[PDB]
Design an enzyme around this catalytic site. Structure first.
Site, PDB file in Angstrom:
ATOM      1  N   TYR A 260      12.783 -20.599  45.505  1.00  0.00           N
ATOM      2  CA  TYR A 260      12.882 -22.172  44.795  1.00  0.00           C
ATOM      3  C   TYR A 260      12.900 -22.302  43.577  1.00  0.00           C
TER       4      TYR A 260
ATOM      5  N   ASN B   2       1.450 -25.643  41.661  1.00  0.00           N
ATOM      6  CA  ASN B   2       3.195 -25.457  42.962  1.00  0.00           C
ATOM      7  C   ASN B   2       4.092 -26.004  42.712  1.00  0.00           C
TER       8      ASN B   2
ATOM      9  N   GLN C 166       0.875  -1.343   0.349  1.00  0.00           N
ATOM     10  CA  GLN C 166       0.071  -0.344   0.038  1.00  0.00           C
ATOM     11  C   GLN C 166       1.235   1.450   0.586  1.00  0.00           C
TER      12      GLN C 166
ATOM     13  N   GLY D 246       1.283 -26.593  51.156  1.00  0.00           N
ATOM     14  CA  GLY D 246       0.809 -27.494  49.313  1.00  0.00           C
ATOM     15  C   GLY D 246       1.836 -27.717  48.666  1.00  0.00           C
TER      16      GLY D 246
HETATM   17  C1  F43 Z   1      -3.390  -6.378   0.977  1.00  0.00           C
HETATM   18  C2  F43 Z   1      -4.736  -5.566   1.461  1.00  0.00           C
HETATM   19  C3  F43 Z   1      -5.886  -6.895   2.025  1.00  0.00           C
HETATM   20  C4  F43 Z   1      -5.520  -6.599   3.161  1.00  0.00           C
HETATM   21  O1  F43 Z   1      -6.010  -8.137   3.532  1.00  0.00           O
HETATM   22  N1  F43 Z   1      -5.040  -6.253   3.752  1.00  0.00           N
HETATM   23  C5  F43 Z   1      -4.780  -4.950   2.829  1.00  0.00           C
HETATM   24  C6  F43 Z   1      -2.984  -4.901   2.961  1.00  0.00           C
HETATM   25  C7  F43 Z   1      -2.938  -3.798   4.576  1.00  0.00           C
HETATM   26  C8  F43 Z   1      -1.797  -4.439   4.817  1.00  0.00           C
HETATM   27  C9  F43 Z   1      -0.998  -3.527   4.282  1.00  0.00           C
HETATM   28  C10 F43 Z   1       0.469  -3.267   4.435  1.00  0.00           C
HETATM   29  C11 F43 Z   1       1.700  -3.279   3.285  1.00  0.00           C
HETATM   30  O2  F43 Z   1       1.255  -2.673   2.038  1.00  0.00           O
HETATM   31  O3  F43 Z   1       2.892  -4.338   3.537  1.00  0.00           O
HETATM   32  C12 F43 Z   1      -1.988  -4.179   6.153  1.00  0.00           C
HETATM   33  C13 F43 Z   1      -0.437  -3.116   7.339  1.00  0.00           C
HETATM   34  C14 F43 Z   1      -2.247  -4.604   7.659  1.00  0.00           C
HETATM   35  C15 F43 Z   1      -0.662  -5.528   7.901  1.00  0.00           C
HETATM   36  N2  F43 Z   1      -0.229  -6.413   7.524  1.00  0.00           N
HETATM   37  O4  F43 Z   1       0.064  -4.451   8.917  1.00  0.00           O
HETATM   38  C16 F43 Z   1      -3.399  -2.890   6.071  1.00  0.00           C
HETATM   39  N3  F43 Z   1      -3.837  -2.846   4.493  1.00  0.00           N
HETATM   40 NI1  F43 Z   1      -5.185  -2.501   4.034  1.00  0.00          NI
HETATM   41  N4  F43 Z   1      -5.182  -0.670   4.930  1.00  0.00           N
HETATM   42  C17 F43 Z   1      -5.616   0.215   5.338  1.00  0.00           C
HETATM   43  C18 F43 Z   1      -6.720   0.532   4.154  1.00  0.00           C
HETATM   44  C19 F43 Z   1      -6.597  -0.067   3.035  1.00  0.00           C
HETATM   45  C20 F43 Z   1      -7.860   0.912   2.500  1.00  0.00           C
HETATM   46  C21 F43 Z   1      -6.786   2.006   1.190  1.00  0.00           C
HETATM   47  C22 F43 Z   1      -7.782   2.056   0.155  1.00  0.00           C
HETATM   48  C23 F43 Z   1      -7.098   3.451  -0.922  1.00  0.00           C
HETATM   49  O5  F43 Z   1      -7.789   3.973  -1.428  1.00  0.00           O
HETATM   50  O6  F43 Z   1      -5.994   3.832  -0.678  1.00  0.00           O
HETATM   51  C24 F43 Z   1      -8.529  -0.586   1.833  1.00  0.00           C
HETATM   52  C25 F43 Z   1      -9.492  -1.245   1.362  1.00  0.00           C
HETATM   53  C26 F43 Z   1     -10.413  -0.413   1.198  1.00  0.00           C
HETATM   54  O7  F43 Z   1     -10.755  -0.190  -0.456  1.00  0.00           O
HETATM   55  O8  F43 Z   1     -11.107   0.294   1.801  1.00  0.00           O
HETATM   56  C27 F43 Z   1      -7.052  -1.773   2.151  1.00  0.00           C
HETATM   57  C28 F43 Z   1      -6.961  -2.857   1.452  1.00  0.00           C
HETATM   58  C29 F43 Z   1      -6.368  -4.189   1.592  1.00  0.00           C
HETATM   59  N5  F43 Z   1      -5.041  -3.699   3.100  1.00  0.00           N
HETATM   60  C30 F43 Z   1      -5.541  -4.608   0.272  1.00  0.00           C
HETATM   61  C31 F43 Z   1      -4.384  -4.241   0.220  1.00  0.00           C
HETATM   62  C32 F43 Z   1      -4.794  -2.952  -1.407  1.00  0.00           C
HETATM   63  C33 F43 Z   1      -4.083  -3.099  -1.883  1.00  0.00           C
HETATM   64  O9  F43 Z   1      -2.936  -3.102  -3.331  1.00  0.00           O
HETATM   65  O10 F43 Z   1      -3.565  -1.460  -2.041  1.00  0.00           O
HETATM   66  N6  F43 Z   1      -6.719  -0.996   3.324  1.00  0.00           N
HETATM   67  C34 F43 Z   1      -7.520   1.682   4.601  1.00  0.00           C
HETATM   68  O11 F43 Z   1      -8.483   2.403   4.250  1.00  0.00           O
HETATM   69  C35 F43 Z   1      -6.544   2.997   5.519  1.00  0.00           C
HETATM   70  C36 F43 Z   1      -6.017   2.297   6.431  1.00  0.00           C
HETATM   71  C37 F43 Z   1      -5.243   1.731   6.263  1.00  0.00           C
HETATM   72  C38 F43 Z   1      -3.808   0.734   7.303  1.00  0.00           C
HETATM   73  C39 F43 Z   1      -2.817   1.185   8.008  1.00  0.00           C
HETATM   74  C40 F43 Z   1      -3.348   2.035   8.891  1.00  0.00           C
HETATM   75  O12 F43 Z   1      -4.192   2.275   9.007  1.00  0.00           O
HETATM   76  O13 F43 Z   1      -2.233   3.232   9.359  1.00  0.00           O
HETATM   77  C41 F43 Z   1      -3.605  -1.213   6.455  1.00  0.00           C
HETATM   78  C42 F43 Z   1      -3.906  -2.231   7.069  1.00  0.00           C
HETATM   79  C1  F43 Z   2       4.070 -15.809  54.780  1.00  0.00           C
HETATM   80  C2  F43 Z   2       3.922 -17.023  53.971  1.00  0.00           C
HETATM   81  C3  F43 Z   2       2.669 -18.106  54.184  1.00  0.00           C
HETATM   82  C4  F43 Z   2       2.306 -17.751  52.817  1.00  0.00           C
HETATM   83  O1  F43 Z   2       1.236 -18.176  51.985  1.00  0.00           O
HETATM   84  N1  F43 Z   2       3.625 -17.777  51.862  1.00  0.00           N
HETATM   85  C5  F43 Z   2       4.868 -16.964  52.829  1.00  0.00           C
HETATM   86  C6  F43 Z   2       5.120 -15.781  52.366  1.00  0.00           C
HETATM   87  C7  F43 Z   2       5.811 -16.234  50.979  1.00  0.00           C
HETATM   88  C8  F43 Z   2       6.098 -14.185  50.927  1.00  0.00           C
HETATM   89  C9  F43 Z   2       7.496 -13.919  51.936  1.00  0.00           C
HETATM   90  C10 F43 Z   2       7.253 -12.149  51.315  1.00  0.00           C
HETATM   91  C11 F43 Z   2       7.718 -11.087  52.456  1.00  0.00           C
HETATM   92  O2  F43 Z   2       7.936 -12.487  53.281  1.00  0.00           O
HETATM   93  O3  F43 Z   2       7.232 -10.184  52.100  1.00  0.00           O
HETATM   94  C12 F43 Z   2       6.870 -14.728  48.877  1.00  0.00           C
HETATM   95  C13 F43 Z   2       7.952 -14.298  48.966  1.00  0.00           C
HETATM   96  C14 F43 Z   2       5.729 -15.059  47.983  1.00  0.00           C
HETATM   97  C15 F43 Z   2       5.145 -13.189  47.673  1.00  0.00           C
HETATM   98  N2  F43 Z   2       3.686 -13.281  48.398  1.00  0.00           N
HETATM   99  O4  F43 Z   2       5.376 -12.714  47.181  1.00  0.00           O
HETATM  100  C16 F43 Z   2       6.804 -16.435  49.718  1.00  0.00           C
HETATM  101  N3  F43 Z   2       6.040 -16.681  50.394  1.00  0.00           N
HETATM  102 NI1  F43 Z   2       6.581 -18.726  51.833  1.00  0.00          NI
HETATM  103  N4  F43 Z   2       9.005 -18.687  50.383  1.00  0.00           N
HETATM  104  C17 F43 Z   2       9.757 -18.710  50.267  1.00  0.00           C
HETATM  105  C18 F43 Z   2      10.101 -20.251  51.493  1.00  0.00           C
HETATM  106  C19 F43 Z   2       9.108 -20.809  52.479  1.00  0.00           C
HETATM  107  C20 F43 Z   2       9.550 -21.678  53.360  1.00  0.00           C
HETATM  108  C21 F43 Z   2      10.288 -21.074  54.246  1.00  0.00           C
HETATM  109  C22 F43 Z   2      10.808 -22.234  55.969  1.00  0.00           C
HETATM  110  C23 F43 Z   2      12.088 -21.365  56.447  1.00  0.00           C
HETATM  111  O5  F43 Z   2      12.432 -21.828  56.857  1.00  0.00           O
HETATM  112  O6  F43 Z   2      12.519 -20.595  55.750  1.00  0.00           O
HETATM  113  C24 F43 Z   2       8.279 -21.565  54.171  1.00  0.00           C
HETATM  114  C25 F43 Z   2       7.168 -22.887  53.595  1.00  0.00           C
HETATM  115  C26 F43 Z   2       8.002 -23.883  54.287  1.00  0.00           C
HETATM  116  O7  F43 Z   2       8.702 -24.165  55.979  1.00  0.00           O
HETATM  117  O8  F43 Z   2       7.839 -24.712  53.853  1.00  0.00           O
HETATM  118  C27 F43 Z   2       7.361 -20.585  53.555  1.00  0.00           C
HETATM  119  C28 F43 Z   2       6.477 -19.736  54.097  1.00  0.00           C
HETATM  120  C29 F43 Z   2       5.681 -18.449  53.643  1.00  0.00           C
HETATM  121  N5  F43 Z   2       5.814 -18.199  53.454  1.00  0.00           N
HETATM  122  C30 F43 Z   2       5.240 -17.875  55.282  1.00  0.00           C
HETATM  123  C31 F43 Z   2       5.723 -17.098  56.077  1.00  0.00           C
HETATM  124  C32 F43 Z   2       6.143 -18.216  56.576  1.00  0.00           C
HETATM  125  C33 F43 Z   2       7.103 -17.043  57.766  1.00  0.00           C
HETATM  126  O9  F43 Z   2       6.167 -16.243  58.962  1.00  0.00           O
HETATM  127  O10 F43 Z   2       8.180 -16.870  57.891  1.00  0.00           O
HETATM  128  N6  F43 Z   2       8.055 -20.039  52.638  1.00  0.00           N
HETATM  129  C34 F43 Z   2      11.100 -21.624  50.923  1.00  0.00           C
HETATM  130  O11 F43 Z   2      11.179 -22.689  51.126  1.00  0.00           O
HETATM  131  C35 F43 Z   2      11.650 -20.608  50.043  1.00  0.00           C
HETATM  132  C36 F43 Z   2      12.149 -19.913  49.186  1.00  0.00           C
HETATM  133  C37 F43 Z   2      10.631 -18.713  49.609  1.00  0.00           C
HETATM  134  C38 F43 Z   2      10.034 -17.679  48.599  1.00  0.00           C
HETATM  135  C39 F43 Z   2      10.770 -16.841  48.618  1.00  0.00           C
HETATM  136  C40 F43 Z   2      12.114 -17.242  47.227  1.00  0.00           C
HETATM  137  O12 F43 Z   2      11.784 -18.492  46.574  1.00  0.00           O
HETATM  138  O13 F43 Z   2      12.997 -16.914  47.195  1.00  0.00           O
HETATM  139  C41 F43 Z   2       8.571 -17.242  49.141  1.00  0.00           C
HETATM  140  C42 F43 Z   2       7.806 -17.372  48.625  1.00  0.00           C
END
Ligand code: F43
Ligand code: F43
Ligand SMILES: C[C@@H](OP(=O)(O)O)[C@H](NC(=O)CCCCCCS)C(=O)O
Ligand SMILES: O=S(=O)(O)CCS
Ligand SMILES: O=S(=O)(O)CCS
Ligand SMILES: [K+]
Ligand SMILES: [K+]
Ligand SMILES: [K+]
Lengths: 262, 548, 442, 548, 56
Positions: free
Chosen positions: B332, B480, B147, B444
């Site tokens: 983790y 998990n 186009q 869990g």
């Molecule tokens: C190949 C198609 C069939 C199709 O599925 N999409 C095309 C082409 C596609 C390509 C053109 C990219 C390129 O040239 O490399 C893109 C930009 C979509 C894309 N792939 O990114 C596009 N048209 Ni089309 N296409 C447009 C339009 C139009 C208008 C242009 C009419 C005129 O008199 O110039 C007519 C449809 C119509 O007659 O109503 C049209 C058809 C067509 N459109 C005919 C090509 C017609 C030709 O041979 O020139 N587009 C428009 O009406 C304005 C918006 C314009 C879009 C680009 C933008 O929004 O900036 C573009 C939207």
């Molecule tokens: C608040 C929860 C309940 C919950 O739903 N997720 C928590 C907290 C959540 C927060 C902690 C963010 C913060 O402190 O501000 C995040 C980072 C998730 C998040 N929201 O971005 C996380 N745990 Ni948890 N959590 C982790 C873990 C753990 C281990 C930590 C045990 C230890 O001895 O330190 C235990 C689970 C277990 O006992 O098996 C655990 C529990 C818990 N985890 C207890 C808080 C425990 C506490 O009071 O200290 N996480 C891990 O086992 C290691 C990876 C670590 C994660 C961060 C990372 O992967 O870098 C983080 C993954």
């Protein structure tokens, strides 16, 4: 039926079984008052009544549900008390309790439990009243080393880190500090990092040697996973059963035959 | 001696690597870090532009750097950088990798040439094709050909935009303008070149690389359309067709549908995206995009490079931004491509497999999967147990799970030549990992882990699928971190072991064997490292059309 | 029958309904109640007349705080609900004799519209019921009030929302339990697209009827997706029978014997019952004395495990009266069950895997929400093939008011509209009726 | 005197504007153009970087500039530029407009605050909200607030990333930090402020603007997710919550689904895209994004400015790239915002309506529609007939059709206050235009044109929809140039005439009343002109992390 | 093979995809059973029948 709890032929596996076995009573290692416990939890003030999230069960009206009413609600649920949390980091250097270990223990031993396991933290969400009851047992007993068991609701980094110069686990917020004079771990902040008016003494760290004996994690320089062939074998058995079940064509061969029959 | 030991030594300078104790709280927090100090300075200077709107402030929330803030070595490189430099927003190389994949589309030319000869009575020769290729290298970057009164795109903004051609027809290739040819015989070793051509036949394809500035302004779905438009214009121009007749519609249909090869497929509505976005990129497709396979005979090296690229794509960018966002998932991901850690595990697995089974030495059986996966997982776990500074490095469980299981899964694939055996090995590694440490990953992490064994060899509806064709939209995998990058490695692993020229699609493999790409796909690690050091020049910047 | 399995059907109250029933009598392919249920799910539409009237009055069109000032239309629609409902009936029906049913809801503030099966029969998918009801409501309102031609397109927009600029009925004042298929995660997932709170509202918060309804829809969907084909069919039938329909009172009895128990005690009870019934046996003993078990019948073992799963949910969540623990419960029931026995967990790990993600996405920042908004067409909870979501339904029946996104907030109107349909509200007793009707015809 | 006569006189300097004859083939082709000369020089310098790959070459195909190649005046400005300067790739201002829309999301805070009080027992005050708003302006751009050893995003890359707040509750607004407040009473004239507040009520919203570099690297679907993640983190930080508890899931669900207001909705599979892409942006939504309504009481001016912005968004970027690409559609769009041509037609129509009916002086009727549409169409056609250089300017029929019909449609809406009456007038204009000149637009221009009258007031399935809510995915409108920008004007037209504060959404209107946006939405014409002169500074450049 | 799925299956399914989904599963299992396809090869049969689903 006599429950097995977990497979394995080493002391690590046995320690896990004892944690899960409800007939095993945790050894109490320290004393923590109700007030200090409530203080570290950081949800409420000691002395105030429990706050509700919904009315008590008897003040609400329910349609008849036989199945529901066969299940005894915990005290906190009866009273409609809000849900709160406690959260621990457990050092991988032989902390006495470990994350999935905790979860399995809780689901065997406690009622109305919501627990989430992660590598760096383990959390319980429970009716606050019942949470406090549970939490006491979780910090007074052998499930808790003040040095390797951190109470922390956020910024939990540390389970995977080396211990500090005093043998305490890393805490980026330093909710506890080492008391050099007594050799005690003292909490100076609540579990989300709010400074306490009066610090809470959690007592002495357990010995390295004691932790090696009672821990629930496998470690090469203690008891390696590689040494527990029984545990590995059962893990593989679970993996294999899942694989064959997923594929289905062989384990369900008799089911397929009937579908194809006639 | 362990491959990660060098990096650990530099990362933890002057520290006893066996000592389980260290010093904290003594670094001055964030001020220990050059990168954080840089960040803080720019944040302050930004107050004026922001008119006082608060911004980056290290005193908000957590006081970072209570521990020592690590530098990371990009594996296989000499680049030691702070982790911030590996964040995708901070790393122009990661950004360009994603854009280079996104802006690429492959289009068959034989159908168009058949239209020219059978419907339009035009003869196609190497000379007319050379004329066509010159026309489209003017039209693709936004130059007019038909186009009058067309406005055009500034060439200075789109210098990365070009079209090249490859063909399985050696006689035709010999006659095409070398300036626009991707030469299969030159770019690939002889045996790989033969394998590629045995699938391609004598068919001819063009590779269109849309401008980077275009996919950044718009999206991936733009690309096949942008390509097709200018293919159309170029045929009309070079062959003197009516500029808009019935036969032209056949070109469009071929270029947009029938003969087009896209990088990725569309997402479902809940996570809707058009073609050529990261979620649609299947693991074996990404493995074929990475070019290490044709410059290396080391199967571990080929897999490791694929995983590095995939870590950046799937966890940092896709999951860490597209599907979430914020501070994100840098480390983790970096766990899978820093400090030569994953390398050690993978090379251990490969040597174990080579000695016991031989590379591609056995049929896949559950016995073999269990043997290899268990062995490699145990070894990888014992490393974190034996080296305190390694555990402090991969401080998150998810990181450690992913790295260990990746080694397990790839090794299984190395032995059996079967990707599905590979992921079955991966899932065994995970639940074994879990029992050993009484922990695995985040809240869990193991959704797919626990579903994994059963769906690994399933044949049902949305469960069964050959692993190479799985990707970020495979249902178990949709959410998990710490899986998808490693899955790409496992998809590559058996084909690397076999010495295959490609994993899933020969056309994709050839299309990225191109030195004129900005990102170096022969080594994702080296490009990412260059981005980390701010030595990588990306495409699509706008300095020419903006004030100084 | 194809399969040899016989079952006793027990009601939600633990009492026997129907004895010695062949398994296929509860199959979605054979049971007439399930057929009628699925039919009703597809053809039933909720119309919010008050919503339409209110939307028009404010020109609140397209939802989400969209308002178009100057295009307001004032119409007494709810006041004339009976006249409108009668016109909708005339436009929606195919004959005076068909199964078209229109019912006023909340005294005409809302309407239940059930499109005749004849229209469904010549349509490709189920969207026809909303689409036809939509056109009927639009023309009924325009005709009833003689709406001006230039105002009329506001009525259309008020009824059907942003469609077709949006791919769905965004901001519409009508709804269907199934969303448009264009929003499905997976092929054939139509019947999985019902939030757990909707199931609870529809069953009026009765625990086992909620888990039953969810299970019926999930397992029927597994037939639609082709998962319940050939080798896998019996697994899904047994899953439906035991977990969904309290076959042989196993579910009711596991809960009964663990009223003051834990997830652990439910597992012990279940494993014991499984050993007792020959569903499972010791394969070998390990050095510790640990016994490794193996299934004697894989599909049946899975059904037993799945039943213990729902029981454990009811026991642990029921104890808390707080639903948030359902994800945790489903996860550790399976985790503990596997290490207790060496057996594969429910759905061979997929129920557990689902619960892992379900846990994560109901306790974190990354997505999800409260447990009541999850369903089988959710990316988080799609992964188990019918065995996880019934636990979610049961759990929300048991929540006493701990959720922000509660049943009333998400599903109140939905409950009022569909809970009238007896098969929706009380599926267990009515499915048993259907089983009796066909057991001898198998 | 005609508004376009000034521009025509400068564009055709020294030519008799009444003369039907002129000289061609005498300008030296492309060498007549300073811009084309710049392009050719840059093309040459680029050969070395491209390694000889052929590039931009004016000797390929059509010899541009056999006629005189026009400059264009951006309407209402002193910017006279060659058309190439208005291409979206060459115009940084057009790119930033799209990115600013794409990276913006609105999230209600009332649900989250309710979660805080009912589930977490936290009380919300203006003080805690101000603290939250400071936290999120650190978290949103990628700063850590909770975890140790987080790496972070370089603040220098994301200075455009920020969060602000607005509320319909005047008492709360008095207590919020001015630095992060969008003040409705300050930014809007009193009557508009009252109307906005009456629709918003006492509700509170934050407006999150994700970094430009993020949406450029990724997509629109990233934005609501990125926002939600850091909303969650900030609530955790500012209110000291458990970092991952049950109530946190409610924030997420609110921020991602229940209380989020997006700019655009998802596309169907054939043209698949996530939220916040141009195709999902409804015409009335775009009208509300444009801010001319609040600084001008001239209904013609308000509509004209919307059309200018919409021309760049819908025809140039959306249809000209996303859905096609290449040289594209610059002049299909510029016809609607250059040389004051459309201005003349619109101001003629407004005057005609004001004199005969009064602005908003009559209920819509077919009589009124026919009267106005016919008169304005006739007048517009007669201008092209009377001024040969005007016809040579809008040389494409589509351009002429869009412009006349826009004037016809807007005028109808000016009179009736009804947008659907407006488009019904639009379709009458088109078929009348067709009969008059025995031509209209390009091959498939009037698909929606012939479908238009029947569907304008339809009430059926995918036909009936109030025009304000129609957009680029409305089926008749999904494909073709020279409509959508003008439809945005017609959506704006009745509300400008009424003096409405907004067209479809008060929250969207308020969200873009912000001077800290890079693009100036109060005058799209002036910003686009600045981009044409290369005087506009965009966001998201990567100079800080790349080599010089 | 022309496979016409019974209307009974269609009647208890939401939409029409059931016919392809069920036929697909039947063909996959029919082939695997007829030739005793190895467990590690079987997922190739599924992929051959139903293509890239569910990644697509
Ligand atoms: C190949 C198609 C069939 C199709 O599925 N999409 C095309 C082409 C596609 C390509 C053109 C990219 C390129 O040239 O490399 C893109 C930009 C979509 C894309 N792939 O990114 C596009 N048209 Ni089309 N296409 C447009 C339009 C139009 C208008 C242009 C009419 C005129 O008199 O110039 C007519 C449809 C119509 O007659 O109503 C049209 C058809 C067509 N459109 C005919 C090509 C017609 C030709 O041979 O020139 N587009 C428009 O009406 C304005 C918006 C314009 C879009 C680009 C933008 O929004 O900036 C573009 C939207
Ligand atoms: C608040 C929860 C309940 C919950 O739903 N997720 C928590 C907290 C959540 C927060 C902690 C963010 C913060 O402190 O501000 C995040 C980072 C998730 C998040 N929201 O971005 C996380 N745990 Ni948890 N959590 C982790 C873990 C753990 C281990 C930590 C045990 C230890 O001895 O330190 C235990 C689970 C277990 O006992 O098996 C655990 C529990 C818990 N985890 C207890 C808080 C425990 C506490 O009071 O200290 N996480 C891990 O086992 C290691 C990876 C670590 C994660 C961060 C990372 O992967 O870098 C983080 C993954
Ligand atoms: C679950 C779903 O979120 P919703 O439940 O839809 O809010 C989905 N998010 C994700 O899966 C987040 C994935 C990346 C963040 C977690 C990585 S572990 C999404 O946005 O479409
Ligand atoms: O703590 S969680 O597992 O919820 C998230 C870790 S990134
Ligand atoms: O000529 S066509 O009408 O097909 C396209 C014009 S952009
Ligand atoms: K900080
Ligand atoms: K040219
Ligand atoms: K982009």
């Amino acid at each position: 039926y006599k429950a097995q709890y977990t497979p394995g032929e080493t002391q690590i596996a046995e320690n896990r079984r004892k944690h899960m076995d409800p007939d095993y009573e945790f050894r109490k290692l320290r004393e923590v008052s109700d007030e200090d416990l409530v203080k570290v939890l950081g949800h409420r003030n000691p002395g105030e009544s429990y706050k509700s999230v919904h009315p008590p069960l008897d003040e609400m009206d329910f349609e008849e549900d036989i199945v529901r009413d066969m299940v005894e609600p915990i005290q906190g649920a009866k009273e409609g008390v809000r849900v709160r949390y406690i959260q621990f980091a457990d050092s991988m250097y032989n902390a006495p309790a470990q994350p999935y270990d905790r979860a399995r223990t809780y689901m065997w031993r406690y009622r109305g439990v919501d627990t989430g396991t992660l590598s760096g933290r383990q959390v319980i969400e429970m009716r606050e009243l019942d949470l406090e009851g549970v939490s006491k047992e979780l910090v007074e007993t052998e499930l808790f080393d003040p040095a390797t068991t951190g109470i922390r609701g956020a910024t939990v980094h540390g389970h995977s880190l080396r211990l500090d110069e005093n043998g305490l686990m890393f805490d980026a917020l330093q909710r506890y500090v080492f008391d050099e004079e007594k050799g005690h771990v003292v909490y100076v902040k609540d579990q989300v990092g709010r400074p306490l008016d009066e610090p809470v003494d959690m007592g002495q760290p357990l010995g390295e040697d004691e932790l090696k004996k009672i821990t629930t994690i496998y470690r090469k320089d203690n008891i390696a996973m590689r040494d527990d062939k029984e545990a590995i074998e059962v893990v593989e058995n679970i993996h294999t059963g899942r694989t064959l079940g997923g594929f289905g064509m062989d384990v369900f061969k008799d089911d397929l035959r009937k579908r194809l029959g006639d | 001696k362990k491959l990660f030991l060098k990096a650990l030594k530099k990362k933890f300078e002057g520290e006893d690597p066996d000592e389980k104790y260290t010093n904290f709280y003594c670094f001055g927090g964030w001020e220990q870090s050059a990168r954080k100090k840089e960040f803080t300075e720019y944040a302050k200077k930004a107050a004026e532009k922001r008119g006082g709107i608060p911004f980056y402030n290290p005193d908000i929330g957590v006081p970072l750097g209570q521990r020592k803030l690590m530098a990371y070595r990009v594996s296989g490189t000499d680049a030691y950088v702070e982790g911030d430099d590996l964040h995708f927003v901070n790393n122009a190389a990661i950004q360009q990798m994603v854009d280079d994949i996104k802006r690429t589309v492959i289009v068959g030319m034989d159908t168009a040439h058949a239209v020219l000869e059978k419907r339009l009575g035009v003869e196609v020769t190497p000379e007319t094709i050379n004329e066509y290729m010159e026309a489209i290298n003017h039209a693709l970057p936004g130059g007019a050909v038909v186009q009058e009164h067309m406005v055009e795109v500034h060439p200075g903004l789109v210098e990365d935009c070009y079209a090249k051609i490859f063909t399985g027809d050696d006689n035709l290739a010999d006659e095409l303008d070398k300036r626009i040819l991707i030469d299969i015989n030159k770019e690939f070793p002889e045996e790989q070149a033969e394998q590629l051509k045995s699938y391609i036949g004598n068919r001819t394809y063009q590779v269109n690389r849309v401008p980077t500035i275009v996919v950044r302004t718009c999206d991936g779905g733009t690309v096949s359309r942008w390509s097709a438009m200018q293919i159309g214009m170029s045929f009309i121009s070079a062959y003197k067709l009516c500029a808009g007749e019935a036969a032209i519609a056949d070109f469009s249909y071929a270029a947009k549908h029938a003969d087009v090869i896209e990088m990725g497929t569309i997402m479902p509505a809940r996570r809707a995206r058009g073609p050529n976005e990261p979620g649609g990129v299947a693991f074996g497709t990404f493995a074929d995009i990475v070019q290490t396979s044709r410059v290396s005979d080391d199967p571990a090296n080929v897999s490791l490079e694929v995983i590095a690229g995939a870590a950046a794509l799937y966890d940092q960018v896709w999951l860490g931004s597209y599907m979430s966002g914020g501070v994100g998932f840098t480390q983790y991901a970096t766990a899978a491509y820093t400090d030569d850690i994953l390398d050690d595990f993978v090379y251990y697995g490969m040597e174990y497999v080579d000695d016991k089974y031989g590379i591609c030495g056995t049929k896949p059986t559950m016995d073999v999967v269990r043997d290899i996966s268990t062995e490699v997982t145990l070894y990888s776990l014992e490393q974190y147990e034996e080296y305190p500074t390694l555990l402090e490095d991969h401080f998150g469980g998810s990181q450690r799970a992913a790295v260990a299981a990746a080694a397990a899964g790839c090794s299984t694939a190395f032995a059996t030549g079967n990707s599905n055996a590979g992921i079955n090995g991966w899932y065994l590694s995970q639940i074994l990992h879990k029992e050993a440490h009484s922990r695995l990953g985040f809240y869990g992490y193991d959704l797919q882990d626990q579903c994994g064994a059963s769906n690994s060899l399933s044949i049902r509806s949305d469960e069964g699928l050959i692993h190479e064709l799985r990707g970020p939209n495979y249902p178990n995998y949709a959410m998990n971190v710490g899986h998808q990058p490693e899955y790409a490695g496992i998809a590559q692993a058996p084909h690397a072991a076999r010495g295959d020229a490609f994993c899933t699609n020969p056309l994709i493999k050839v299309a990225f064997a191109d030195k004129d790409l900005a990102f170096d796909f022969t080594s994702p690690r080296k490009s990412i490292a260059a981005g980390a050091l701010r030595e990588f020049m990306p495409e699509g910047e706008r300095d020419l059309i903006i004030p100084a | 029958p194809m399969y040899e399995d016989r079952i006793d059907l027990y009601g939600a109250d633990g009492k026997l309904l129907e004895e010695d029933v062949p398994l296929e009598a509860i199959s979605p392919l054979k049971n007439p109640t399930i057929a009628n249920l699925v039919s009703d799910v597809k053809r039933s539409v909720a119309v919010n007349l008050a919503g339409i009237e209110g939307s028009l009055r404010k020109a609140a069109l397209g939802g989400k705080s969209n308002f178009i000032p100057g295009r307001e239309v004032e119409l007494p629609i709810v006041e004339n609900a009976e006249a409108i409902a009668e016109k909708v009936k005339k436009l929606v029906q195919t004959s005076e004799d068909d199964d078209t049913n229109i019912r006023l809801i909340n005294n005409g503030q809302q309407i239940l519209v059930q499109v005749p099966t004849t229209r469904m029969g010549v349509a490709a998918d189920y969207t026809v019921s909303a689409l036809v009801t939509g056109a009927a409501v639009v023309q009924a309102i325009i005709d009833e009030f003689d709406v001006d031609m230039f105002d009329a397109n506001a009525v259309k927009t008020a009824v059907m929302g942003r469609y077709p600029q949006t791919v769905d009925f965004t901001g519409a004042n009508l709804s269907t339990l199934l969303g448009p298929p264009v929003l499905l995660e997976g092929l054939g997932y139509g019947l999985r697209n019902i939030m757990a709170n909707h199931v609870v509202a529809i069953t009026r918060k009765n625990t086992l009827n909620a888990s039953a309804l969810s299970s019926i829809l999930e397992q029927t969907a597994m037939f639609e997706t082709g998962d319940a084909v050939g080798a896998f069919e019996r697994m899904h039938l047994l899953g439906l029978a035991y977990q969904g329909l309290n076959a042989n009172n196993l579910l009711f009895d596991l809960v009964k014997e663990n009223g003051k128990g834990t997830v652990g005690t439910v597992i012990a009870s279940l494993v014991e019952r499984a050993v007792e019934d020959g569903v499972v046996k010791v394969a070998r003993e390990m050095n510790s004395g640990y016994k490794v078990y193996e299934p004697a019948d894989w599909a049946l073992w899975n059904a037993y495990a799945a039943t213990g799963l729902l029981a454990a949910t009811i026991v642990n969540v029921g104890a808390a009266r707080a639903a948030q623990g359902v994800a945790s419960t489903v996860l550790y029931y399976n985790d503990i069950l596997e290490y207790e026995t060496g057996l594969p967990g429910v759905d061979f790990g997929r129920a557990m895997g689902t619960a892992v993600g379900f846990s994560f996405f109901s306790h974190s920042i990354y997505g999800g929400g409260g447990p009541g908004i999850f369903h089988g067409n959710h990316v988080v909870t799609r992964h188990s093939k019918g065995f996880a979501l019934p636990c979610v339904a049961a759990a929300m029946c048991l929540d006493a008011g701990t959720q922000m996104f509660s049943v009333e907030k998400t599903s109140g109107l939905i409950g009022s509209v569909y809970s009238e349909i007896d098969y929706f509200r009380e599926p267990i007793v009515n499915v048993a009726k259907g089983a009796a009707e066909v057991k001898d015809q198998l």
